[PDB]
Each structure stands twice: as C-alpha cells, then as structure tokens.
Amino acid sequence: SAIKPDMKIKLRMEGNVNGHHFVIDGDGTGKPFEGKQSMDLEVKEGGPLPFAFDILTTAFNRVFAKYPDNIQDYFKQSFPKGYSWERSLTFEDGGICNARNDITMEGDTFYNKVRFYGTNFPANGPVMQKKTLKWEPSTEKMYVRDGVLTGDVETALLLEGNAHYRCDFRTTYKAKEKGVKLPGAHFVDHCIEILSHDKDYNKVKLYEHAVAHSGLP
C-alpha cells in the first residue's frame, strides 16, 4: 500500500465567484482507511470573501472514504500517480459553477491543485448575502457513464430561517494511470462540517467523514 494510515494534506485553491478573485491555502491530516480528514484553510488573497464560504467546502478527495472489501476502491488504487476530478454544481436559483482538483502524492502528503469558478448567483440570494448555515449530510451515487466513473449528489444548504437551498453535483473521476479498473455502482455517504471559523471566514477548520456502501445497513 502506497497509502499510509495517516496522510498529510497540502492544498491551494484559486477561484472566482461572480467576478471576485480569491486564493486559499489548506494544511491538514487524514485517515484514508477510516474515511476521516480535517484541514486548516486560510484566505491568502481577496478576503474578506463577499460570498458564503460554504459553497467552496466540497471542493476542499474521495481517497478519504472507508471502502468495504466487496467494493473496488478506484481512489486508493489511483496512487501513487494520483487522479483528477471535475464537478458541476447547479443551485435552484440559477447559480452554477465548475470545480476541478488534480491530486498527486509525494511521500506521506497529498497535493491538491484546486480551481473553483462560480457565476449567475443573484445579488439578493443566500450565497451573495451570506445566509448559509451548513451542508446537510448527503449520499453520492457512484456509477459508470460512457467509460467514466461518475458521482451524482442531490443535496441542500440549510439557510437562516428553517429554509433549504438545493444543490445538484455531478463529479467525473479519472485515474492518471490507464487500466485502473472501474468499480461497480455503489454509494458514498458524506458528513461535511465547519468545526471553527474567525469573523469573516478568513480562517476555517473543515472536517469530512465518508463511508462507501451498497445500499444495505
């Protein structure tokens, strides 16, 4: 196993949401086999961010997910060469973006080159007014579509005032190494949370727990 029980995480995101440019650095640790990771995020340019930090967080690696013996682990088989993913997020009020991560490994560290581009968010909407509280726990449906491993998520951000703001993610995953065998269809349950933050979310601690299953208890 190229992958140790304790891996470090290094991360730089460059992005633009509704024109606003920003650069964010990440430093964290994770237990790939337990499906748990936590990282410290710091806005380096464009702070304070004039949009809800929450829209970024699923962009800050499915190598951190507990996979049972009876499901092919595409992600942990992708290393040490690594893999990329591209995501389109579609929000109920027309907000749309495209995120991509190119993930590499050097010794005991995952390096993440992340790009995040959002547009079409209404000025008066919860994202540009900062009314989001958190992502609800999700289930990612994994299946193969024209020879590409694809994950679908139908989820929502909880807003101030008991309201939900609906998300649809589609992610395409691709190993760098030709001939990493595709898995069969399956599910990954996700638990993403902001553990702490300063006034304007210039510093954020982020935690994710993920578990792969076939649908049964």
Numbering used by the authors: 2 to 61, 65 to 221
Give verbatim lines from the article:
The system studied was a reversibly switchable fluorescent protein (rsFP) which is a representative of a class of proteins that undergo a reversible photolysis reaction from a highly fluorescent “on” state to a weakly fluorescence “off” state. The specific rsFP used, rsKiiro, is a mutant of Skylan-NS33 specifically developed for ultrafast time-resolved crystallographic studies due to its ability to form crystals that diffract to high resolution (∼1.1 Å for single-crystal cryo-MX), high photoswitching quantum yield (∼18% Trans-to-Cis in the crystal), and high protein expression yields. The chromophore of rsKiiro is formed from the Ala-Tyr-Gly tripeptide at residue numbers 62–64 in the α helix.
In this study, we probed the light-induced reverse reaction, from the Trans to Cis chromophore conformation, initiated with 2 ms 405 nm pulses at a range of optical flash energy densities (0.1–6.7 mJ/mm2) after the initial Cis-to-Trans photoconversion had been driven to completion using ∼13 mW/mm2 of 473 nm CW illumination. A total of 435,200 images were obtained across 6 laser energy densities at 405 nm of 0, 0.1, 0.53, 1.78, 6.74, and 14.43 mJ/mm2. Data below a value of 0.5 in Fourier shell correlation were discarded, leading to a uniform limit of 1.7 Å being applied to all data sets. The initial examination of the chromophore-omitted maps clearly shows increasing occupancy of the Cis state at higher energy densities.
